[PDB]
Design a protein around this nucleic acid. Structure first.
Length: 155
DNA sequence: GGAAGCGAAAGTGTCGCAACCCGAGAGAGGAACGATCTCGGGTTGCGACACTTTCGCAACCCTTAATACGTTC
């Protein structure tokens, strides 16, 4: 991990320098470059810059995956490395995963959840508390605080 | 990267069919010799197709891993 992070220090530096001037923010989760901007029609020129910079730096060894270059906007689904970005500009787990968690909690309410799926739900609710804290409060309202306390951590 | 099978893709040879040629022959006419149409091989050109070669998909996972619960690469 650290070797791969260092091998793209110059790539990250050049991309960030050339990308912040056009008002585009750039990140990389070590294999997955993310660009976003509030200015329309400026991201369409980024993949060519990425390709030419990769050729300049790594030659032919490192290259983009042209089948994995995805454009998106508020008209479509928006998720960055597993977290859905709402139309309200807030982080979320997505409607489908939040309904899945609701189904799991409802199953636990009636004692239809075995040990393995109970552990999976406690793990997923820890992750949900990390990503979307308001979901925990909403589930406390929906499924009562006592039931959530019995499932989640008690000490 | 690439077993083992197998099939795609492209190139090359081959082999049968058509088209023509060429000698032999019975004998039209009409009064003889041999016109003319056919029989039997033989040659060549051509194109469809069979055969030949190369490439590429992707087993396994090497001695050599860790094992609370969840996302991410």
């Amino acid at each position: 991990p650290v070797i791969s992070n260092f091998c793209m220090y110059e790539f990250d530096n050049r991309i960030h320098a050339a990308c912040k001037k056009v008002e585009i923010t750039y990140t990389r989760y070590a294999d997955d470059l993310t660009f976003s901007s509030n200015i329309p029609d400026v991201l369409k020129a980024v993949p060519s810059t990425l390709e030419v910079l990769l050729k300049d730096l790594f030659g032919s060894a490192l290259r983009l995956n042209h089948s994995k270059t995805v454009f998106s906007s508020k008209a479509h689904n928006r998720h960055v490395t597993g977290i859905t970005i709402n139309n309200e500009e807030t982080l979320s787990l997505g409607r489908d995963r939040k309904r899945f968690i609701k189904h799991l909690i409802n199953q636990y309410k009636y004692g239809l959840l075995d040990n393995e799926d109970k552990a999976y739900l406690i793990g997923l609710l820890a992750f949900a508390s990390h990503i979307e804290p308001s979901f925990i409060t909403r589930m406390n309202e929906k499924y009562s605080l006592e039931l959530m306390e019995r499932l989640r951590g008690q000490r």
